[PDB]
From a paper:
The Omicron variant of SARS-CoV-2 carries multiple unusual mutations, particularly in the receptor-binding domain (RBD) of the spike (S) protein. There are 15 amino acid (AA) substitutions in the receptor binding domain (RBD) of the S protein, nine of which are located at the binding interface of the SARS-CoV-2 RBD and human ACE2 (hACE2) receptor, namely K417N, G446S, S477N, E484A, Q493R, G496S, Q498R, N501Y, and Y505H. Receptor binding is the key step for SARS-CoV-2 infection.
RBD binds to mACE2 (14.23 ± 6.22 nM) with a higher binding affinity than that of hACE2 (18.2 ± 1.33 nM). Consistent with the flow cytometry and SPR assays, mouse, rat and least horseshoe bat ACE2s were found to initiate the entry of Omicron BA.1 pseudovirus, but not prototype pseudovirus. The S protein of Omicron BA.1 was found to comprise 30 AA substitutions (15 on the RBD), six AA deletions and three AA insertions. Numerous mutations on the surface of the S protein were observed, which may enable Omicron BA.1 to escape immune surveillance obtained from natural infection or vaccination.
Numbering used by the authors:
A (entry chain A): 298 to 676, 690 to 695
B (entry chain B): 15 to 68, 77 to 142, 153 to 176, 185 to 210, 215 to 247, 257 to 297
C (entry chain D): 317 to 416
D (entry chain C): 447 to 496
The structure:
């Protein structure tokens, strides 16, 4: 390394600054606060009385945490058709609000709830925009919304003058006139009621069984978004150089118990150089002190290559107990681990010296280490005095 | 709503704000340090408008600006809440903060405010006729010989409404005190004017003495001092005089 | 095995395939009822004989035919002529009766 | 409608530059194995432009 730094194949007597020393952390911490803000679900899904398709029920959802992971405990339904986004672990987005529409239709009209679709429900009952973002969930309700004598409660629209605009709802009970004469308010010729019933019966096929349909639409407005989703967290480890993320504060270092007394509203902490040196755990309200992982400079003490190839190493500003030990890669020095236990580790106010024997004699300085300590090549070995 | 034409009008007074209106700019802990910041502050030794109610009665629709410093010297909480908005009617969207007997309630809707909104134990209100379309609601613990000094700072930036607060057991006193952050709301609306709310007590009506003060924030540079326990204890206004 | 749809689950639940034990009386006539709203039933007593096998296949042909026009506005849900109905069940019975 | 064009929607990780993947295996959405049949939490990775 000294030869590459000097760009030469020969080295003269002296001490040279070559490279640096780091710790190279392991594993990541992702602590986020408690997920305690329940979405208004379990009331539009596990309800007991839905509304008609022409009078579909609407709910507005905001300032909550979406929990799109309990729907796997629901019925064996096969309808989870999602457009605009993909349903494969892609619920991490944030939206200003969500509109949830609920109604009940027949088993054969489930395909009609889709953009660019025509039919009876899509043209007279429920119209969807081309740029619709969100999705439709339909599940069978044969055992609950069917009557042996006939479930004549649910109704639908059969005759209308024109089609329905997207996200439009009409509950007018006016008589539809098909002929060219005034109706006079009576149901006679060329005039029929626009609303009809479904008459659900349990003996019907899969094409006539009632199906409950819920449509979620996501809005992304210029107002701040408040409907995001579950924020997962790991467990925290202390006294180990790790990466960490705290509510969006990213970093690397060692977390320790802190004596600082934050004010109740304060989250971070900074030192006089304006660097983050303390943090507060969002889940448990205590203060953790942050320290950078060990780093420093490396100097190679050598006699001339004309004399020998033995060297000594000085780690600058490093206590000898935090000397590299390494496993496979936790140190930016290109893995030339020098023996520590048996290679005469010495401690100087300039750092940690490895590869030199400290003697109790005194000579004139040859290679200055610092703080009154010099090194020389004598006897043959490298000594410090 | 009701109208009581018994007002005794006199021009609003002017008084001096010495060093009042300092708040914590952010949520960063600093210990034993001097920190220079640039933000919307109330300049030192400034003119502040002074209203008093005793029968004295005045509820003008004061204009909003980059921010508002509100002070009240009072006992038994005659002043309860506030309204913020642009037109103060049902055409636009307005925010309303009310201090109930036990909880503060914040709502943004299209209210229909009367010419004189007020409250009148009394559990009757004359503020609005109906709420048209509401998009945010919040409820929490209440915000609230003169003894009570309530200081508030209202800001509305980037769709966030921020309230900083301070309460002191005691015109404007001498000394220094920093207003800790209280409330942040993601209302995301536009505010141009505001108007206070009082609660009367019918025994006509008898009202106790109370005073409130209004000042306006401007962009300025300050030098703040943090002691060992991260508390702001002193400040310097860089544009006041040569010495500063 | 020829390219026809599989029968509905409710078909095996609403159909009588064996003679009732007691409490009920059946006119003893093989019928294939099209109840309506996607409901199809077979009413007949089935015995261990190739005669009953052939009759069951003949009624099954009618069952396949009837559901094959479920997509018509209640007026076209018939045959073009009166001869198509009984012709469908004859070919299936003949084919299944072949020694191969 | 031409359905001859297909493209991938579900993948475990983002793709490196200038790589070509023609894997037709059913993407494992749920924890339980799909056993090579699509359905609930088992979707065909490729879908058509149409
Ligand atoms: C986040 O949730 C955890 C749930 O465990 C809370 O921790 C518990 O807090 C209660 C106090 O109400 C203690 O009695 C338990 O011993 C705690 N358990 C654990 C495992 O820590 C924690 O307090 C919550 N944090 C916030 C800010 O609400
Ligand atoms: C409805 O009830 C079931 C009962 O087990 C529950 O698992 C499910 O989560 C509930 N639905 C919602 C949306 O919470
Ligand atoms: C180095 O670490 C040891 C072990 O904790 C400690 O006793 C010593 O004070 C530290 N500093 C020096 C200069 O040795
Ligand atoms: C009463 O009405 C008059 C005009 O109609 C208005 O000027 C005044 O502000 C209202 N309220 C009171 C308390 O007088
Ligand atoms: C405050 O207002 C008064 C008017 O009452 C004016 O004379 C004075 O110059 C203003 N400014 C200060 C600093 O007093
Ligand atoms: C809170 O306000 C409601 C009206 O919004 C009122 O009925 C109730 O009495 C108030 N609470 C108390 C403690 O007075
Ligand atoms: C209610 O107000 C919000 C905010 O201005 C707006 O987005 C929404 O469309 C309003 N509701 C209706 C029904 O117009
Ligand atoms: C408030 O600001 C918005 C954003 O520029 C603007 O559209 C709106 O018109 C403003 N309010 C009024 C009452 O003009
Ligand atoms: C600051 O904290 C210390 C605790 O170390 C406490 O003794 C002191 O009263 C607090 N306040 C001030 C102004 O020092
Ligand atoms: Zn026949």
């Amino acid at each position: 390394e000294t030869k590459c730094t000097l760009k030469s194949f020969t080295v003269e007597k002296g001490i040279y600054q070559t490279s640096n020393f780091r710790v190279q952390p392991t594993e990541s911490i992702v602590r986020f606060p408690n997920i305690t803000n329940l979405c208004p679900f379990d009331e539009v899904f596990n309800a007991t009385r839905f509304a008609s398709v022409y009078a579909w029920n609407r709910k507005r959802i905001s300032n909550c945490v979406a929990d799109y992971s309990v729907l796997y405990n629901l019925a064996p339904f096969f309808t989870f058709k999602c457009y605009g986004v993909s349903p494969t672990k892609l619920n991490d987005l944030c939206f200003t609000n969500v509109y949830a529409d609920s109604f009940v239709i027949r088993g054969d009209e489930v395909r009609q709830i889709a953009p660019g679709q025509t039919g009876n429900i899509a043209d007279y009952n429920y119209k969807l925009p081309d740029d619709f973002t969100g999705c439709v969930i339909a599940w069978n309700s044969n055992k609950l919304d069917s009557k042996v004598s006939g479930n004549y409660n649910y109704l639908y629209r059969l005759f209308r003058k024109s089609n329905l605009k997207p996200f439009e709802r009409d509950i007018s009970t006016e008589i539809y006139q098909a002929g060219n004469k005034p109706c006079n308010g009576v149901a006679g010729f060329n005039c029929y009621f626009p609303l009809r019933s479904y008459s659900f019966r349990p003996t019907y096929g899969v094409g006539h069984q009632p199906y409950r349909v819920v449509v979620l639409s996501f809005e992304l407005l210029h107002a701040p978004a408040t409907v995001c989703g579950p924020k997962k967290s790991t467990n925290l480890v202390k006294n180990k150089c790790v990466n960490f993320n705290f509510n969006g504060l990213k970093g690397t270092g060692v977390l320790t118990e802190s004596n600082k007394k934050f004010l109740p509203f304060q989250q971070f902490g900074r030192d006089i150089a304006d660097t983050t040196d303390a943090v507060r755990d969002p889940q448990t309200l205590e203060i953790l002190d942050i320290t950078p992982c060990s780093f420093g400079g490396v100097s190679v003490i050598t006699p001339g290559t004309n004399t020998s190839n033995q060297v000594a190493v000085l780690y600058q500003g490093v206590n000898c107990t935090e000397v590299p030990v390494a496993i496979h890669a936790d140190q930016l020095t290109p893995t030339w681990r020098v023996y520590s236990t048996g290679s005469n580790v010495f401690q100087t106010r300039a750092g940690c010296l490895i590869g030199a024997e400290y003697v109790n004699n005194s000579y004139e300085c040859d290679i200055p280490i610092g703080a009154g300590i010099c090194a020389s090549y004598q006897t043959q070995s490298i000594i410090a005095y | 709503c009701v109208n009581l034409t018994t007002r005794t009008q006199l021009p609003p007074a002017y008084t001096n704000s010495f060093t009042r209106g300092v708040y914590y700019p952010d949520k960063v802990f600093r210990s034993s340090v001097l920190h220079s910041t640039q933000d919307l502050f109330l300049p030192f030794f400034s003119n502040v408008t002074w209203f008093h109610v005793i029968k004295r009665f005045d509820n003008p629709v004061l204009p909003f600006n980059d921010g508002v410093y509100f002070a009240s010297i009072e006992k038994s909480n005659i002043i309860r809440g506030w309204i913020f908005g642009t037109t103060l009617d049902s055409k636009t969207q307005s925010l309303l903060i009310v201090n109930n007997a036990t909880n503060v309630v914040i709502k943004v809707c299209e209210f229909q405010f009367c010419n004189d909104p007020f409250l009148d134990m009394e559990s009757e209100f004359r503020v609005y006729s109906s709420a048209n379309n509401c998009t945010f609601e919040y409820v929490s613990q209440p915000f609230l010989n003169f003894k009570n000094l309530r200081e508030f700072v209202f800001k509305n930036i980037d769709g966030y409404f921020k309230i900083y607060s301070k309460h002191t057991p005691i015109d404007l006193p001498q000394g220094f005190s920093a207003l800790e952050p209280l409330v942040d709301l993601p209302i995301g609306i536009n505010i141009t004017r505001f108007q206070t709310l009082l609660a009367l007590h019918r025994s006509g009506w008898t009202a106790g003495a109370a005073a409130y003060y209004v000042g306006y924030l401007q962009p300025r540079t300050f030098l703040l001092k943090y002691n060992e326990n991260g508390t702001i204890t002193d400040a310097v206004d860089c544009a006041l005089d040569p010495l500063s | 095995s020829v390219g026809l749809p599989h029968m509905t689950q409710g078909f095996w639940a609403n159909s009588m395939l064996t003679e009732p034990a007691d409490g009920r009386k059946v006119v003893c006539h093989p019928t294939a009822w099209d109840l309506g709203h996607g409901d199809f039933r077979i009413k007949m007593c089935t015995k261990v004989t190739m005669d009953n096998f052939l009759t069951a296949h003949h009624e099954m042909g009618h069952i396949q035919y009837d559901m094959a026009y479920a997509r018509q506005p209640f007026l076209l849900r018939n045959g073009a002529n009166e001869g198509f109905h009984e012709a469908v069940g004859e070919i299936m019975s003949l084919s299944a009766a072949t020694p191969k």
